[PDB]
Enzyme design. Structure first.
Site, short mmCIF file in Angstrom:
data_model
loop_
_atom_site.label_atom_id
_atom_site.label_comp_id
_atom_site.label_asym_id
_atom_site.label_seq_id
_atom_site.Cartn_x
_atom_site.Cartn_y
_atom_site.Cartn_z
CG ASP A 34 -8.62 10.37 13.64
OD1 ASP A 34 -9.50 10.30 14.53
OD2 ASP A 34 -8.44 9.47 12.80
CG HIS A 97 -11.40 7.45 11.65
ND1 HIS A 97 -10.80 7.99 12.76
CD2 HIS A 97 -12.21 6.46 12.10
CE1 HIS A 97 -11.22 7.35 13.84
NE2 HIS A 97 -12.08 6.42 13.47
CB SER A 416 -13.71 6.31 16.17
OG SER A 416 -12.52 5.56 16.19
#
Ligand SMILES: [Ca+2]
Ligand code: NA
Length: 936
Positions: A34, A97, A416
């Site tokens: 990521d 994230h 995601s």
């Protein structure tokens, strides 16, 4: 004190059942690729490190040495490895994230957490390999970087690799070969790679619907498009652990409602609230002072509604949906203002509630969702650029609570979030299979696991439409770890390669063949039926909703123990073709699910999606027709001025190109003052030497003689745009360049010029890869693309200006679909370099101030503009305005000019210039004083 985990309270995918069978990951390794991570988060811990694959930095370094890896490092007992594969990047590292995604997969927060409920991911006892990758240069570079991350993860022992990132619409075929080999390498080693579908909805984006005329509206990109990966879409279960607010309704009863808050309300504090419409005007807030403002969604941005409430002194904000059965939307943080999103029904309840007082609770709880079981509006639709079926499966992705930067937690929505949940389920199922099918190779168990997860996934049903959501939106269904763990059967296409059937192009009658595999020691009997469906259409748009056509009768099949058997379901949609073609003239999908049950009355046991296209998919038009051909002046991303359908202004002084996104040709308008200044060698022109600007405009457009600030399309009698160039190097209409709004990806885009006599006289450089213009937003992609390689300067292949005449400027491009025919779009382009012949002298009448020219202009191309310009000083800036001729051919010259400040400035004869321009842009500009001196 031992806290409950979020999963203890809500486990939509039934992960606990699989964990009862396969444990929680101890001794296993999983990897997350990521954009960045908080490597110190409290969620990164193991209950018993003695059971870990890597018990120390030394164990890790030993593995690194074995594989010749000379970079990356051990972080802690949980994070056995971390490496940044994009350090060359100048920008900072975002940790939110990656941390959130990793938390869903393997978070293991301790009871000492500040949170009410512990975040415990799917494989909380597994170790993590965290790999950072980010685009810092090109996309090929990026793919080579994540390809190494994949390979390193496999070699360091990861059993699953989660990739919750991607770039919309890209074709798998365009990835670097090393990236393709890396996916194959992981697969060959039995390492599952899970990818997020993306959050781009369909062509047009989350705020639009694609046109029924254009069926290839998928936007799934890479790495998702790789067939070996398991791509995950997002949906909302019918209940969710959510923060809540309580209100008393008329009946005198307490009523709890879910809230999704940005910033924080004072818990247990009774707040007063006031309705404020859509919060657009101050009037609306004439009573929010010191209270919470209840605002309806719509018209304006959330940030604006919130800023306006703040202006009026509101202490908080409640925005309720304007959609029925909608999803919670995370509201923007506008200067710390507490803002919560609620459903329409709840908003309407508050709107007409007697006691307008509300309290926010501190303890979250599970409550039904306003959406019920429904696929997320943002989830990316397939097909992939080369036509393969994606996504593969769906998982919960709405407001998932997980770990974020600086040891904190937050809810985020996205495919995601769906992906890591599936990644963890895949890892646990693989562990289960090490015991259940020990004689298979790692690759065989991986293949089995993916097929079982997809087969056992439950096809979601759209209650409003009475049909299953399209497989192009939900893949093989919503993952169910309980059904997956219990499964002893799975279903595939006839070639036993995948749990989905792609039929490519079909007629109204076709067959769907499926193979049922039985891994039980006892024969099993099932009933099966196929749904037959297509796209629902509303007017000229796809509704992005399913349309049931019919369902077949239930048939039966007995599969012997440890064997397989095929079944074939005949499909005939001939009776619907007339009405379907009326809605989707270029063809439509004929798809559905073949569903299996132990008995017709029991629940679905397995389901496999099939998709066919009733038409010729590969040859669907890749380019939206030129804006010039639009009857009403509008296109998908451009709305016309109904009052003037031919108005087509250019770029002006815009910084971003959000307007005018359509297919057309560009060229440039260079006013005479700038042409003159450049010919004279003036270096600093803009806002200094002249008040006029060089503007990029659309070919075929022209301003009126009496400037109104607009350009208009002009066309030949035959209706084609009057595109014309004067290749003489003055920057005024010297070239034409292709601008296209691509409805589909394409390859080998090239422009050529035909002389209309049978010869190609010029060919541009090739633009090898073209990506569809899937949205019109700076955050993803603009609605059209300008291709500099197609710019034609009016010269032939030998480098010489072509003779005056009309030519065909042809743009060729080929769809990505296998075997598609090349397509093209043509434009007539006139080339004319003839300088206008104009008066060389004139006389002036002082009485009426009329200037009479010695002769009239003679131009090859029709006259465009014939004017007298006057340049006057307005605060030191030479400012230019124009005079159109009188009907007798003379020009009346004013004695003064009005300034912006409202003052007057006297005009001298030396301030006037006679300017003549033709439709190809050939131009002459002569000082009026020179014409007057033009006498012997
Ligand atoms: Ca020119
Ligand atoms: Na399924």
């Amino acid at each position: 004190t031992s806290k409950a985990t979020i999963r203890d309270l809500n486990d939509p995918s039934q992960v606990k059942t699989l964990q009862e069978k396969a444990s929680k990951g101890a001794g296993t390794v999983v990897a997350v690729i990521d954009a960045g991570f908080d490597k110190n988060h409290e969620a990164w811990r193991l209950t018993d490190k003695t059971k870990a694959r890597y018990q120390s930095k030394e164990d890790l370094e030993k593995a690194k040495k074995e594989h010749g890896i000379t970079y990356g490092e051990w972080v802690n007992d949980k994070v056995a490895y971390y490496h940044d594969y994009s350090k060359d990047g100048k920008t900072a590292v975002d940790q939110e994230h990656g941390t959130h995604v990793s938390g869903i997969l393997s978070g293991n927060a301790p009871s000492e957490t500040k949170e009410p409920y512990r975040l415990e991911g799917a494989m909380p006892e597994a170790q993590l390999l965290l790999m950072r990758v980010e685009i810092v240069n090109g996309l090929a570079d990026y793919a080579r970087n994540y390809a190494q991350a994949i390979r390193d993860a496999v070699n360091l022992g990861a059993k699953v690799i989660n990739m919750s990132f991607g770039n919309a619409a890209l074709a798998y075929a365009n990835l670097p070969d090393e990236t393709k080999k890396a996916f194959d390498y992981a697969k060959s080693k039995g390492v599952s790679i899970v990818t997020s579908a993306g959050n781009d909805s369909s062509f047009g984006g989350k705020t639009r619907l694609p046109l029924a005329d254009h069926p290839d509206y998928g936007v799934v990109g890479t790495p998702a498009a790789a067939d070996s990966t398991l791509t995950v879409a997002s949906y909302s279960p019918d209940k969710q652990l959510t923060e809540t607010a309580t209100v008393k309704t008329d009946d005198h009863q307490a009523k709890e409602m879910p809230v999704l808050s940005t910033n924080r309300f004072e818990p247990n504090k009774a707040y007063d609230y006031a309705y404020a419409n859509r919060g657009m005007k101050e009037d609306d807030f004439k009573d929010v002072k010191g209270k919470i403002a209840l605002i309806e969604r719509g018209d304006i941005d959330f940030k604006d509604k919130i800023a306006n409430a703040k202006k009026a002194g509101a202490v908080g904000v409640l925005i309720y949906d304007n959609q029925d059965k909608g999803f919670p939307i995370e509201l923007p943080n506008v200067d710390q203002m507490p803002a919560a999103f609620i459903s329409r029904k709840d908003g309407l309840l508050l709107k007409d509630n007697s006691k307008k007082t509300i309290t926010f609770n501190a303890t979250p709880k599970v409550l039904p969702t306003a959406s019920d079981t429904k696929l997320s509006r943002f989830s990316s639709w397939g097909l992939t650029a080369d036509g393969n079926i994606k996504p593969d499966i769906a998982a919960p992705g709405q407001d998932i609570l997980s770990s974020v930067a600086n040891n904190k937690y937050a809810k985020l929505s996205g495919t995601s979030m769906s992906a890591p949940l599936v990644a963890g389920i895949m890892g646990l199922l693989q562990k289960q299979y090490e015991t259940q099918y020990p004689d298979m190779t790692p690759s065989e168990r991986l293949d089995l696991a993916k097929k079982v997860l997809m087969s056992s996934a439950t096809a979601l049903y759209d209650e409003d439409e009475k049909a299953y959501f399209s497989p192009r939106q939900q893949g093989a269904g919503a993952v169910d770890a309980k059904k997956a763990s219990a499964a002893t059967m799975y279903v595939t296409d006839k070639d036993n390669t995948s749990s989905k059937v792609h039929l490519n192009n079909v007629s109204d009658k076709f067959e769907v063949t499926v193979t049922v595999h039985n891994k039980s020691d006892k024969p099993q009997e099932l009933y099966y039926q196929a749904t037959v469906q297509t796209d629902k259409v509303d007017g000229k748009h796809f509704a992005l909703a399913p349309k049931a056509l019919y369902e077949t009768s239930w048939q039966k099949i007995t599969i012997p123990a440890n064997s397989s058997k095929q079944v074939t379901v005949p499909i005939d949609a001939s009776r619907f073709s007339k009405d379907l073609l009326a809605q989707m003239k270029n063809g439509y999908f004929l798809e559905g699910f073949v569903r299996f049950k132990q008995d017709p009355k029991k629940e679905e046991l397995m389901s496999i999606p099939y998709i066919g296209f009733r038409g010729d998919f590969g040859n669907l038009s890749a380019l939206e027709k030129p804006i010039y051909d639009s009857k009403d002046g509008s296109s998908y991303y451009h709305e016309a001025n109904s009052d003037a359908k031919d108005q087509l202004d250019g770029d002006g002084l815009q910084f971003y190109a959000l307007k005018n996104n359509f297919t057309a040709l560009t060229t440039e308008s260079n006013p005479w003052t700038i042409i003159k200044a450049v010919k004279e060698g003036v270096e600093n022109i803009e806002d200094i030497e002249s008040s006029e600007i060089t503007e990029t405009i659309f070919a075929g457009t022209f301003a009126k003689q009496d400037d109104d600030s607009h350009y208009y399309i002009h066309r030949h009698a035959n209706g084609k745009p009057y595109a014309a160039i004067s290749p003489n190097g003055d920057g005024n209409r010297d070239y034409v360049q292709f601008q296209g709004t691509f409805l589909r990806n394409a390859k080998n885009l090239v422009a050529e010029v035909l002389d209309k006599e049978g010869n190609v006289v010029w060919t541009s450089e090739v633009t090898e890869q073209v990506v569809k213009n899937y949205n019109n937003d700076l955050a993803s992609t603009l609605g059209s693309t300008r291709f500099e390689k197609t710019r034609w300067d009016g010269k032939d292949k030998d480098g010489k200006v072509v003779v005056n005449g009309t030519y065909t400027y042809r743009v060729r491009y080929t769809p990505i679909s296998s075997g598609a025919k090349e397509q093209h779009t043509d434009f007539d382009v006139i080339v004319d370099n003839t300088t206008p012949e104009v008066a060389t002298s004139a006389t002036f009448s002082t009485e009426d101030r009329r200037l009479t020219l010695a002769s009239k202009p003679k131009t090859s191309q029709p006259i465009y503009r014939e004017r007298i310009a006057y340049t006057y000083m307005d605060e030191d800036l030479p400012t230019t305005e124009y005079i159109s001729p009188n009907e007798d051919g003379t020009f009346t010259l004013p004695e003064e000019a009005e300034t912006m400040e409202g003052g007057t400035v006297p005009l001298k004869m030396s301030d006037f210039t006679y300017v003549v321009e033709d439709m190809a842009g050939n131009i002459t500009y002569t000082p009026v004083t020179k014409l007057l001196e033009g006498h012997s």
